Amino acid sequence: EVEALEKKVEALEFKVQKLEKKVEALEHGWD
Amino acid sequence: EVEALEKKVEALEFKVQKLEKKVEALEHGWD
Amino acid sequence: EVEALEKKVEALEFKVQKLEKKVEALEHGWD
C-alpha cells in the first residue's frame, strides 16, 4: 500500500506544481 | 493511518483532475 | 515513510484548496 501511495502522491505533486504555474500565468496575465 | 491517507489521496486525485480540466479550458479558451 | 506521506498529503491539500479558489475566481470572473 505505502509505495502505491508514494507513487500517487509524487504524481499529484507534479500535477499540482503544473497547475500552480498555469494558474499563476492566468492570474498575472503572463504571455 | 494508511487508509486515512488513501482516502485523502483519492480525494486529491479527483480534485486535481477537476482542476486540470478547468485550467485547460481557460488556457484554450474553450466554450 | 507514513509521516513523510502525511506531511506531503496535507501540503497538497492546502495547495489544492488554493488552486480551487483561484480557478473558481477565474471561471466566475470574480473581482
Side-chain angles (χ1 to χ4, degrees):
Chain A
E1 310 165 324
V2 184
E3 189 157 288
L5 292 193
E6 291 176 339
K7 282 174 95 297
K8 296 174 163 296
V9 163
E10 304 319 307
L12 282 162
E13 292 183 328
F14 168 85
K15 282 187 222 223
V16 161
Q17 174 174 125
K18 293 295 295 208
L19 289 171
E20 293 181 333
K21 292 171 175 162
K22 285 175 191 276
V23 166
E24 283 303 330
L26 306 174
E27 286 208 325
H28 285 270
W30 295 335
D31 322 279
Chain B
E1 310 165 324
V2 184
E3 189 157 288
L5 292 193
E6 291 176 339
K7 282 174 95 297
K8 296 174 163 296
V9 163
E10 304 319 307
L12 282 162
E13 292 183 328
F14 168 85
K15 282 187 222 223
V16 161
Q17 174 174 125
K18 293 295 295 208
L19 289 171
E20 293 181 333
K21 292 171 175 162
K22 285 175 191 276
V23 166
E24 283 303 330
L26 306 174
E27 286 208 325
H28 285 270
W30 295 335
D31 322 279
Chain C
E1 310 165 324
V2 184
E3 189 157 288
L5 292 193
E6 291 176 339
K7 282 174 95 297
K8 296 174 163 296
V9 163
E10 304 319 307
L12 282 162
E13 292 183 328
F14 168 85
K15 282 187 222 223
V16 161
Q17 174 174 125
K18 293 295 295 208
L19 289 171
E20 293 181 333
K21 292 171 175 162
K22 285 175 191 276
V23 166
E24 283 303 330
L26 306 174
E27 286 208 325
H28 285 270
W30 295 335
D31 322 279

